[PDB]
Amino acid sequence: MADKFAAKFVSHKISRTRWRPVSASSLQQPDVFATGSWDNEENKVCVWATSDFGATSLDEEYQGDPKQLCDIKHPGDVMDMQFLDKERIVTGSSTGTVTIFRHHENNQTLSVNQRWEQAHYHVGSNMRAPCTAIVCSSPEIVSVGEDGRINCFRAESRDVLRTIDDADSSTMHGVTFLRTTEILTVNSVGQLKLWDLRKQGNDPTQIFSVTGERVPLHCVDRHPNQQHVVATGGQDGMLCIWDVRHGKMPMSLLNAHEAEMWEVHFHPSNPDHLFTCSEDGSLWHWDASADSECAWLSTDPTKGQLEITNLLPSSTLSVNSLDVLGQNLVCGTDAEAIYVTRRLFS
Amino acid sequence: SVEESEISAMNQMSWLMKTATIELRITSLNRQRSHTQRLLHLLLDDMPTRKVRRKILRILDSIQFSNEIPEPLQLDFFDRSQIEQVIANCEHKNRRGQTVCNVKLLHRVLVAEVNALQGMAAIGQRPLLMEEINTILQYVVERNKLLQCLHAKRHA
């Protein structure tokens, strides 16, 4: 399976990787992705292509190394990155700044479209304290940080629409939309928190936690079709599955990794697949479809054999980010490397 | 005796012909006498055994080489000579080389003729025109049926 990916060597640490969203009406496979770098005083955002703009042969083995289209130098260390749409990229910075970049495809350039230089900061001292995660639902943007704040922005508004000050006395690490006006946050004390933006009170609507476990939460993802099914990963390498309507405890606890689980992602268009990466250097593909030929909520160990495959060679370097679109997967590493496959299921 | 489609009966007979023909040819080219014997014996001995016309002649008797002809079209509001010309024209050549409007020209051609005949004021005369077009249709249909029956007989 190692022969499916071309690996490109670049002198830049890889933290985040994301596919450019394709229109649901397009028969075109995803071909472009972005990367963020870290571990430096100054880092960059890069845009990459997987195909040569011009190969019309349906029959050539993809040995194509991903090609850098363009880059931009970002002040501070890049933390998180998402596409807002086809032309706009949002970043969270180690400086606590949230920035919207505009990509000008005709000229192959990036430009600063908008910034919030005081999105994340410690109340009182006023010292910089990192924007750790962002989530987009156009035109709305939510950010979280080490200052325990939840900020709500609108892309066209210069002012912050809402701040929830002192939302967490601990660092928040992740945020997702539950519903249009409700978010979930996770923090360094092993809590999953639910919250409504509309509600005036800064208090969370609900708090979930493992009983007797202090372990911090590093990642969270929502099942695309089932808004109540959530996956999380921890410092112990455990995969937790939650039904946010049923109790305050996970429905399933699965031994996934030997070390810290950095990211978890459902496949955006085929959510019977899930992907996870770890400090142990591994990148796992989880397949819940194997009995058909929500599977993730099966409590019957006799129904739904999960097939599990390690995608990288043994003793692989830290895999900080992955993204999956159709038959294509990209991931970024601390080995100054981008791995790309265009034939995930072949 | 597929009177139904004398056409069908005829086609049946035709194919059967070609077939048994090449059959006997090759069987004899080989030397199989008994086979050939029984075959032709039967086929030709109209002589009564255990005036019984020979089968080959009976087959020829079943083919009528004379066929009936359609009542002349009569038009109260309309020229006949013109309708016969129109019938001659829109009768396009089918794959067998027969001039037939077929459903095509028929339907669309009839609609076009009705559109051309404008009868504004005298709405009152409408049922008549309706019945009249019906007969024209029946006639062209009969004519086409007949042409088809004919090419069939030719090939047979």
Partner: protein, 120 residues
């Protein structure tokens, strides 16, 4: 059938079913008695004119039945025109004649028109 349903009818169910099947005279009469100001007749006739102008053959064959159920006060004066022109002439007539102090008029017509496509 509606013969039976006329056995328990009403002052406007009638108006509607009848404005339904052509009969654009019988109903202007039922209305002017029970005084109930009629813009449903003009909108429905405008709809039939539009459907005819974009109508198929079958629609032209059915149209002679409702056209004959009216005169067309007086018919004609030259080149013929496949209905089309037929209902637009019943227009000029059922308009200029049966016309009102306020607006059962230009407005209701221009509207159903821009409403379904039409260089006026």
């Amino acid at each position: 059938s509606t013969a039976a349903i006329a056995g328990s009818s009403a002052a406007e169910e009638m108006v509607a079913l009848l404005v339904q099947a052509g009969l654009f005279d019988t109903a202007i009469s039922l209305c002017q008695t029970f005084k109930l100001a009629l813009t449903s007749v003009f909108e429905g006739l405008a709809c039939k004119c539009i459907r005819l102008q974009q109508g198929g053959e079958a629609a032209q064959a059915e149209a002679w039945e409702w056209l004959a159920a009216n005169q067309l006060a007086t018919v004609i004066t030259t080149k013929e025109s496949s209905a089309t022109d037929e209902a637009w002439r019943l227009m000029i007539s059922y308009l200029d004649k049966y016309e009102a102090k306020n607006t059962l008029y230009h407005h209701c017509i221009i509207n159903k028109l821009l409403s379904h496509g039409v260089p006026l």
